């Protein structure tokens, strides 16, 4: 039961992403959606999603500070390649 999913979300210039990862071996899934950021706000982005691709970036076999350091240098459209659980 798994599709891959491509979703573009606008992340305004003074608004977080506000979205927290884990690593689960190589998978990077999202734990949780912040109230107030840029993910709860565009309604695309759920809690237990795997990241595949964010902008053409591989996210697959990074840890998490690897991906909350890539994740503080994109501003505007974000285009994430995910797997939703
Ligand atoms: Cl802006």
């Known amino acids: 039961g798994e599709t891959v999913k491509i979703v573009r979300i606008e992340k305004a210039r003074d608004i977080p992403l506000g979205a927290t990862v884990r690593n689960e ?3 990077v899934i999202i734990s949780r959606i912040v109230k107030g950021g840029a ?3 565009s ?3 759920h809690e237990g999603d795997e990241v ?3 902008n053409g970036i ?3 076999g990074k840890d998490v500070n690897e ?3 890539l994740l503080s ?3 505007g459209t974000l285009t994430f390649v995910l797997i939703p659980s």
């Open 52 to 54: 595949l691709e964010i």
């Open 39 to 41: 993910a709860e706000k």
């Open 43 to 45: 309604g695309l982005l």
């Open 73 to 75: 240098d994109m501003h």
């Open 25 to 27: 071996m190589d998978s």
């Open 67 to 69: 991906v909350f350091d």
């Open 58 to 60: 591989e996210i697959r």
